[PDB]
Recover the amino acids of this structure.
């Protein structure tokens, strides 16, 4: 089920001592699927980036969420809406806020 | 006859840098030169024959 | 005969060529559709930023990919084989004519009743009468009765040739030591052209076939005149 | 291995059976029975059969198996 | 960082297309190639017999 | 050192390089012959003034393109380069015999070019049917030199097939089953099995023709109780497998190319692709008489050969749909090799479909020995083989050389070649339907327009060939050395760098169970 | 694929030379034979 | 095991996978298969 | 280099195996030290600098469309045009006259004879002639 | 034997102009050969 | 506030929609082709032969001088 898939990926990124290899393996695996990851999954991955002192990877994860949506323009702004409290809490600037959307 | 395979093993394993087709000694060189001379000479003769046969 | 800028078959002169035209129309519609589907699907696969790069399960889709092509092939083969068995069906011919291939001309033998035989050579371009067709005319045409079942027997006195008349649906190899049979029936009078259709050496391009289809009464008058 | 023999079972052997089933299916349907001729080398009766009336073969089909006196 | 395509692509496309059409039209119409088109709606049939 | 390395090779990579050079040279010969064909046909009348020479050119065109360009490039070149690398093997099983498979080809080619230079040539067609190919209608040495050319080519390929089958079965890592080998390796193993079984039958048939020409045998001579049709059965028993031999390595390269440039780790439906290639290989031995629908065989025989031939579309369609399903969801890299592969999928499909039209014996009566057949095989074989070769060549050139091509030039090359082959061959369908025979030096006037266009197309492809030579020069001239390529985790042939060292896998891969 | 900069870059002018010489190597010999077919 | 400081590993991540995952394994800290995360350690 | 992990900008491999920049100056090392504290205390320019140490191109950069199609299509048309020059040369210097059967008067006679023998009278040819009005339909 | 780019081939790429001459002779000889064989047969 | 858009199976949804569209187009083409080609051809042959007089056709050809034998 969708709920069980999402729960497993939240658990994966929530492991306190997740290492850099596991963060990369998780994101590189997840973006192979026919889906844009749920905000709860991205929230967990962004907090992993914080535990790993990796600001750049947090920005890259927001870029690949936008990318996975393809022409479905409504997905990225919905995701950023849902992540706003976490972005504010962790001081994560969006790619747009950084000019990296060119 | 006596089993002289060990003596041939020693000859063909000698660290002399020779490829296996020349490792038996001077007779290998002679047989190689006869073979290659007949092959190359024969091939040149086949081309001459082609030249002859290409015209009435 | 063919005409300039022709895309398809010569107009059918025999019932079996008519059948072949209808069967080709059916088959070409399938060829077009499958060609077009493959091109369309290529374009569909190549026109999205959406991705799915993880392992995909193939089992379900391979049922569609084998069953649907099997059905299509059956739908081609059924009418194909119906025509094959029609073109073999026992007919009672009223006439047998032999043709022998040679390097490079045809001979014809009408030996049902009289020993009539003659040779049939291409008219050289320098000898064509005004309005006659380059590489297609012969000196002696194959005079035959229209609207009658004719048995053609085909052989060769030298190398392989092949006796063809596209508008009648005919092509039978001419093999020395072998007597190959085909059936000819023209729905119409007129002149019907074909060309040698097995490479037989330097003048393969230059040993055509010309049938002259006339009413039975005129065929009989022609036969009687030949005595 | 088992994997290779399963591959042969599903990939070659059963497809062959399906094709021969298709072939048989297409050529099914009754052919016109031949004129009865009381040939003396056929419909042999040297002793009555041990079932029925003694004059019918074990898997007698009235449509295609004439008796010594002809079709039923 | 403008590349070769940014600098020359427009010129290559316009000059290539112009040259290609002009030379094929000349070849097709001006050097006596016999296309042998259909006589339908083109040829007036003339007595041959 | 130069003679030891290049005349006395026991190295799979150097022998692969020799085959690629040989094949590229043969391709120039074959192309020149093809342009002479289309120059003779490019306006009505005679150009050469000698129809025997036209027939010699057609015959040589086919033998050069099949035996000296396609098979050497696909099997000798890509096969020798890639197969050992893709299974982590240190070389071929028989590295010295491998070198003789190569060195038989220059003599084979010399015999073919001797055939064309003595007497009036072998104007037979590549089928070499008696009695035209016999000692009356083709007296003198030309046909015998053609037969001997084919004997040497046949020995080369039989010994090569033994080498590839042994290598692929015996020299994988001990943990790697056959079902863990890449599709290109499968395609070469299957091709090799077809060669091993088919070439000996050709060898028997052409040997019979040799003895009918020189030892007063009558296998094919009715005066002695022989039969020209027996030759046709023996030739085509080889010749149908041969057309699958020409395409199968191409199917293997296409699978690798489509997977690579779709950004995938694997082709869609691996076991279906293996099944389809084995099914095509098997069915390829039971269909040959579709080359003989006009020779006078029995109706039930025609019915069987129609039906068996149509079956090949099913496994073939699984491969085409599987390539499409490999693109599906890809991060597509529009590389020149990807363009070659997409051109392949479409043009192969068109040619395969006109094959299905021809499989219908009834319609084949009217299409046999016409330009419809020429159109069919120039789509599926000529474009299919050549597009797979050019895709493999631009994909793997950096592996083999250590240098990159100019991608923009390679895309221009593709675009020119796509226009040229379609302008050349598409109109030949109309010529066939309207009844123009093949193997003709001239045609009735009605056929002028489509012959004119076809011949103009042939020059466009020539421009593409010349540009290809410039593109290879420019890569060797500029010396852009490769650093990295992506997807090495699923493309083992790249993991030793570009070019790989003379000896690779001295220490084999570690693969556990 | 990633690569080092060209060791021996081939300028536009160098490419025009190589392209020209390549085309001429194909066209001149065949052209000579085809021009002289009459003489044959 | 290796006679040197690196060796190519192929990982068949699951039984009956047709896809083998290839990578150089270097001397030092254990590396992981990039597909399944299986650990490998070189032992010169 | 072939045997080591490498950097790749690929939309489907967003977190590559190595950082774009392997060897840091003292200022870049201090910024990585700063990265261990609150990111809210990081400036915009510092956030962009951390991104550029880790990655070479952004998604927007790696995904950009190019003008290459113009060069490819234009160059292909140039070489196809060059081909017509070869065909003009062939027509001028290789091809002699075509047969007299292509002369206007021969074609007019040949066309009448084709209509008189009713070539392709169902669809192909004679079908397009009006035999009542003595003109093309 | 010599290893690496430009060293695993039976021809030199040391000089791009010598290379152009060798490639010209190589592919040109193959392309020319059928024209000269046709000429040889016609001159019989 | 923005509502949740579909985030799962976007590639599969696109494929399904366009495979159905390709089917519908194939049906429309089969209808065009039956009318423009296959039925056109059946009707042309049937119309030609419905009142066809082979003797009158022969007499026209003979008067035009086409035949060797008549
Ligand atoms: C790129 C490089 C350049 C390309 C090369 C250029 C080639 C020359 C162009 C051809 C144009 C022909 C023309 O004058 O068209 C007039 C012609 C006028 O129509 P018409 O005279 O009334 O013909 C109706 C016939 O009764 C119709 O019946 P018919 O029996 O007379 O015609 C049958 C015939 C004629 O078929 C056709 O009508 C044309 C074929 C389609 C071309 C695409 O079709 C064939 O059998 C051809 C064999 C094709 C094999 C399979 C090909 C797969 C196609 C791939 C699909 C991709 C989709 C995009 O218009 C066309 O049909 C267009 C062609
Ligand atoms: C009908 C017959 C069939 C014929 C088919 C022909 C096609 C088959 C080709 C197969 C390749 C044969 C290679 C065997 C060894 C070559 C021997 C030789 O003559 O060397 C000179 C020559 C290289 O000259 P170089 O640059 O001075 O290199 C010398 C060494 O670096 C420095 O080493 P070194 O100083 O120790 O020794 C070099 C020196 C002398 O060294 C020696 O001691 C060697 C002496 C024995 C060699 C005998 C070779 C026999 C070849 C038979 C053909 C096979 O060589 C010379 O400079 C003078 C020799 C010139 C002889 C001409 C041979 C040309 C090949 C055949 C062309 C066809 C002509 C037929 C005419 C047709 C008329 C109807 O070797 C070649 O023939 C190489 C091919 C020519 C260049 C082609 C470039 C094309 C690139 C396109 C790439 C497409 C493939 C992708 C590859 C992937 C990248 C990895
Ligand atoms: C690459 C080489 C190659 C390949 C692969 C093929 C593939 C096929 N060929 Fe062809 N063929 C030749 C090379 C090739 N051929 C050559 C050289 C000749 C001439 C020899 C000579 O005389 O000189 C020839 C001649 C030849 C003839 C003899 C014609 C004659 O001389 O009168 C026939 C007869 O059936 C034939 C049929 C086929 C068929 C049915 C296939 C099939 O394998 C095609 C299968 C492919 C597809 C069908 C397309 C993909 C499928 C799908 C997208 C699925 C759905 C499709 C359907 C439901 C139909 N070909
Ligand atoms: C692989 C097989 C193949 C290939 C590639 C070709 C390529 C070409 N062929 Fe054909 N041809 C045949 C196989 C092939 N042919 C066969 C079997 C016959 C029948 C013979 C007979 O009837 O007996 C035939 C017959 C045939 C005829 C019919 C002759 C007749 O019936 O009278 C025609 C007519 O136009 C023709 C034209 C062409 C043209 C214009 C090309 C090409 O010009 C099309 C463009 C392709 C290229 C120019 C090739 C490019 C490749 C290279 C240069 C290799 C590069 C190498 C590396 C990158 C490593 N060929
Ligand atoms: C689906 C097929 C499977 C077969 C099963 C069917 C029948 C019973 C058992 C069969 C055993 C095999 C052979 C015995 C002999 C004859 C039967 C042959 C097979 C059969 O069933 O033949 C039938 C006749 O059966 C008859 O006579 C019937 C005869 C019944 C009695 C048989 C007598 C037993 C013979 C003794 C056996 C001796 C064994 C010796 C062992 C060796 C020891 C050293 C054929 O039917 P039909 O109507 O003539 O023609 C068809 C017309 N539509
Ligand atoms: C008109 C006349 C035309 C005919 C021309 C004849 C053609 C060519 C001339 C033949 C010259 C032959 C010279 C000997 C070849 C020996 C090959 C051999 O024996 O090859 C072996 C492999 O093939 C094996 O085993 C099994 C394979 C062994 C095959 C032996 C040679 C066969 C040659 C002809 C075969 C035709 C087949 C007939 C069927 C059509 C050894 O492989 P290598 O790579 O060497 O070494 C590997 C090392 O590990 C060994 O220590
Ligand atoms: C012929 C053109 C294209 C055909 C493409 C057919 C591909 C079928 C894909 C099947 O793969 C599945 O996709 C689903 C997600 O959508 C996953 O959930 C499932 O696990 C996966 O196996
Ligand atoms: C009728 C004639 C019409 C003109 C046709 C001209 C066709 C050639 C166009 C040039 O194309 C470019 O050439 C660059 C220069 O080689 C390539 O960059 C390559 O060159 C350098 C390596 O030395 C690096 O800067 C690049 O990364 C590298 O990809 C680049 O890919 C390519 O698009
Ligand atoms: C199928 C592939 C072929 C494609 C066509 C090739 C395109 C033509 C290339 C040019 O070839 C040359 O053409 C010249 C004419 O333009 C010839 O000069 C010939 O004619 C000249 C002018 O009449 C004389 O000055 C020369 O002596 C005389 O050899 C010359 O021999 C020949 O090399
Ligand atoms: C008769 C046959 C005709 C064949 C003609 C061949 C035409 C090929 C034109 C190539 O032009 C370019 O193609 C690139 C790729 O080759 C494009 O990359 C862009 O588009 C792609 C998306 O479709 C992306 O993958 C790339 O990253 C992106 O930069 C690029 O913008 C475009 O200028
Ligand atoms: C005496 C000698 C021993 C050989 C040995 O062990 O070296 C024997 C053993 C087997 C003998 C061979 C076998 O007996 C078979 C053959 C018998 C014939 O009568 C003589 C030749 C013949 C071919 C023998 C030659 C020779 O006498 C051999 C070789
Ligand atoms: C059984 C075998 C291997 C499975 C495996 O071990 O991975 C698979 C591989 C390819 C399969 C075949 C291909 O997918 C093509 C056919 C697809 C149909 O849906 C069933 C029959 C069909 C003919 C398949 C039967 C069987 O499932 C095959 C033969
Ligand atoms: C592991 C071995 C794989 C070999 C497969 C070969 C498949 C082609 C079959 C040819 C059979 C000949 C039929 C007559
Ligand atoms: Cu007689 Cu061809
Ligand atoms: Cu075949
Ligand atoms: Mg034939
Ligand atoms: Na001609
Ligand atoms: Zn793994």
């Amino acid at each position: 089920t969708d709920e069980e898939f999402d729960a497993r990926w939240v658990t994966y990124f929530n492991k306190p001592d997740i290492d850099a290899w596991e963060l990369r393996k998780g994101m590189n695996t997840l973006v192979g699927y026919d889906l844009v990851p749920e905000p709860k999954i991205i929230d967990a991955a962004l907090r992993a980036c914080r535990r790993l002192n990796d600001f750049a990877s947090a920005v890259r994860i927001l870029e690949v969420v936008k990318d996975k949506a393809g022409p479905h323009k409504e997905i990225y702004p919905y995701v950023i809406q849902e992540l706003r409290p976490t972005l504010n809490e962790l001081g994560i600037s969006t790619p747009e806020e950084l000019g990296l959307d060119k | 006859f006596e089993n002289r395979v060990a003596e041939k093993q020693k000859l063909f394993q000698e660290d002399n840098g020779l490829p296996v087709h020349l490792k038996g000694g001077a007779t290998d060189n002679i047989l190689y030169r006869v073979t290659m001379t007949l092959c190359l000479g024969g091939t040149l003769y086949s081309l001459y024959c082609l030249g002859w046969a290409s015209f009435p | 005969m063919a005409y300039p800028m022709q895309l398809g078959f010569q107009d059918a002169t025999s019932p079996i060529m008519e059948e072949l035209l209808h069967f080709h129309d059916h088959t070409l519609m399938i060829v077009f559709l499958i060609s077009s589907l493959v091109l369309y699907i290529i374009s569909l696969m190549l026109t999205t930023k959406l991705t799915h790069t993880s392992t995909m399960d193939a089992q379900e889709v391979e049922t569609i990919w084998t069953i649907l092509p099997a059905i299509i092939l059956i739908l081609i083969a059924l009418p194909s084989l119906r025509i094959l068995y029609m073109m073999d069906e026992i007919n009672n011919p009223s006439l047998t004519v032999k043709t022998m291939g040679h390097q490079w001309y045809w001979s014809y033998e009408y030996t049902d009743y009289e020993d009539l035989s003659f040779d049939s050579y291409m008219i050289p371009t320098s000898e064509l009468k005004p309005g006659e067709l380059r590489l297609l005319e012969v000196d002696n045409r194959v005079v035959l009765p229209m609207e009658m079942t004719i048995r053609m027997l085909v052989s060769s006195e030298d190398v392989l040739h092949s006796w063809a008349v596209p508008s009648l649906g005919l092509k039978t190899d001419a093999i020395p030591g072998r007597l190959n049979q085909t059936t000819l029936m023209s729905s119409r009078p007129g002149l019907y052209y074909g060309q040698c259709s097995e490479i037989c050496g330097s003048n393969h391009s230059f040993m055509p076939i010309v049938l002259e289809l006339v009413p039975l009464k005129y065929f009989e008058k022609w036969s009687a005149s030949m005595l | 291995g088992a994997r290779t023999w399963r591959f042969l079972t599903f990939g070659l052997a059963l497809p062959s059976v399906a094709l021969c089933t298709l072939n048989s299916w297409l050529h099914s349907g009754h052919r016109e029975r031949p004129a009865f001729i009381p040939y003396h080398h056929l419909r042999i009766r040297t002793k009555p059969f041990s079932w029925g009336d003694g004059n019918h073969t074990f898997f007698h089909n009235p449509r295609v198996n004439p008796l010594p006196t002809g079709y039923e | 960082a403008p590349d070769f395509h940014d600098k020359y692509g427009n010129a290559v496309l316009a000059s290539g297309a112009t040259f290609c059409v002009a030379v094929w039209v000349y070849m097709a119409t001006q050097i006596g190639i016999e296309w042998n088109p259909s006589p339908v709606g083109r040829v007036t049939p003339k007595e041959w017999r | 050192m130069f003679i030891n390395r290049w005349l006395f090779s026991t190295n799979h990579k150097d022998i692969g390089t020799l085959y690629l050079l040989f094949g590229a040279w043969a391709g120039m010969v074959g192309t020149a012959l093809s342009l002479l064909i289309r120059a003779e046909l490019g306006q009505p009348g005679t150009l050469l003034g000698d129809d025997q020479i036209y027939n010699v050119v057609v015959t040589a065109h086919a033998f050069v393109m099949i035996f000296f360009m396609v098979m050497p490039i696909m099997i000798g070149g890509f096969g020798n380069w890639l197969v050992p690398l893709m299974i982590g093997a240190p070389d071929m099983a028989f590295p010295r015999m491998n070198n003789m498979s190569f060195w038989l080809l220059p003599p084979s080619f010399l015999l073919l070019l001797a055939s064309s230079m003595v007497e009036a040539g072998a104007g037979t067609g590549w089928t070499v049917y008696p009695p035209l190919a016999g000692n009356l209608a083709h007296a003198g040495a030309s046909v015998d030199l053609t037969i001997f050319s084919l004997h040497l080519a046949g020995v080369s390929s039989i010994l090569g097939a033994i080498n590839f089958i042994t290598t692929i079965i015996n020299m994988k890592p001990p943990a790697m089953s056959q079902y863990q080998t890449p599709l290109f390796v499968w395609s070469v193993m299957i091709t090799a099995v077809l060669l091993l079984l088919s070439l000996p039958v050709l060898a028997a048939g052409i040997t019979m023709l040799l003895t009918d020409r020189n030892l007063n045998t009558t296998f094919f001579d009715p005066a002695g109780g022989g039969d020209p049709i027996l030759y046709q059965h023996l030739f085509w028993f080889f010749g149908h497998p041969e057309v699958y031999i020409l395409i199968l390595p191409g199917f293997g390269m296409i699978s690798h190319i489509v997977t690579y440039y779709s950004g995938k780790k694997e082709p869609f439906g691996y076991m279906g692709m293996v099944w389809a290639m084995m099914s095509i290989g098997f069915l390829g031995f039971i269909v040959w008489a579709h080359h003989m629908f006009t020779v006078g065989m029995d109706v039930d025989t025609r019915a069987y050969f129609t039906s068996a031939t149509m079956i090949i579309a099913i496994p073939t369609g699984v491969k085409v749909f599987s390539w499409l399903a490999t693109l599906h969801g890809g991060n597509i890299k529009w590389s020149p090799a990807m363009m070659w592969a997409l051109g392949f999928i479409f043009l192969f499909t068109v040619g395969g479909l006109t094959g299905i039209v021809l499989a219908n014996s009834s319609l084949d009566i009217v299409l046999h020995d016409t330009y419809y057949v020429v159109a069919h095989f120039h789509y599926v074989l000529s474009m299919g083989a050549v597009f797979a070769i050019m895709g493999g060549f631009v994909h793997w050139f950096p592996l083999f050389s250590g240098y990159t091509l100019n991608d923009t030039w390679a895309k221009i090359h593709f675009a020119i070649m796509f226009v040229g082959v379609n302008m050349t061959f598409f109109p030949q369908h109309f010529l066939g339907l309207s009844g123009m025979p093949r193997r003709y030096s001239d045609y009735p006037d009605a056929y002028t327009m489509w012959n004119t266009i076809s011949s103009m197309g042939s020059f466009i492809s020539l421009t593409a060939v010349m540009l290809m030579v410039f593109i290879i020069w420019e890569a060797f001239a500029s010396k852009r050395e490769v650093l990295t390529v992506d997807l090495t985790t699923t493309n083992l042939e790249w993991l030793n760098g570009c070019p790989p060292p003379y000896h690779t896998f001295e220490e084999p891969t570690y693969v556990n169970l | 694929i990633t690569a080092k900069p060209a060791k021996t870059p081939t300028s536009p002018k160098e490419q025009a030379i190589g392209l020209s010489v390549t085309f001429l190597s194909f066209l001149l010999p065949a052209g000579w034979v085809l021009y002289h077919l009459d003489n044959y | 095991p290796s006679i040197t400081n690196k060796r190519i590993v192929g990982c068949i991540c699951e039984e009956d996978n047709s896809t083998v995952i290839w990578f150089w394994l270097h001397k030092g800290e254990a590396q992981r298969c990039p597909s399944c995360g299986t650990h490998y350690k070189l032992v010169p | 280099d072939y045997a080591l992990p490498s950097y790749v900008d690929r939309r489907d491999y967003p977190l590559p195996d190595v950082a774009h920049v392997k060897n840091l100056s003292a200022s870049q090392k201090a910024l990585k030290e700063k990265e261990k504290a609150s990111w809210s205390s990081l400036s915009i320019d510092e956030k962009v600098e951390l991104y550029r140490l880790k990655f070479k191109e952004s998604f927007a950069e790696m995904n950009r469309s190019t003008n290459e199609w113009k060069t490819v299509v234009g160059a292909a048309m140039f070489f196809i045009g060059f081909t017509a020059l070869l065909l003009i040369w062939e027509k001028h210097y290789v091809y002699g006259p075509i047969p007299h059967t292509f002369e206007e008067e021969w074609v007019a006679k040949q066309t009448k004879r084709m209509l008189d023998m009713k070539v392709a009278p169902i669809q192909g040819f004679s079908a397009k002639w009006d035999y009542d009005k003595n003109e093309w339909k | 034997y010599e290893e690496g780019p430009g060293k695993n081939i039976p021809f030199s790429v040391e000089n791009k102009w010598r290379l152009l001459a060798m490639m010209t002779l190589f592919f040109g000889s193959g392309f020319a050969a059928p024209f000269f064989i046709v000429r040889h047969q016609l001159l019989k | 506030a923005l509502a949740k858009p579909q985030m799962r199976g976007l590639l599969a949804r696109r494929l399904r929609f366009h495979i159905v569209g390709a089917f519908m187009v194939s049906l429309g083409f089969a209808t065009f082709y039956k009318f423009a080609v296959a039925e056109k051809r059946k009707k042309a042959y049937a119309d030609f032969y419905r009142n066809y007089d082979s003797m009158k056709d022969f007499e026209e050809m003979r008067k035009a001088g086409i035949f060797q034998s008549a």
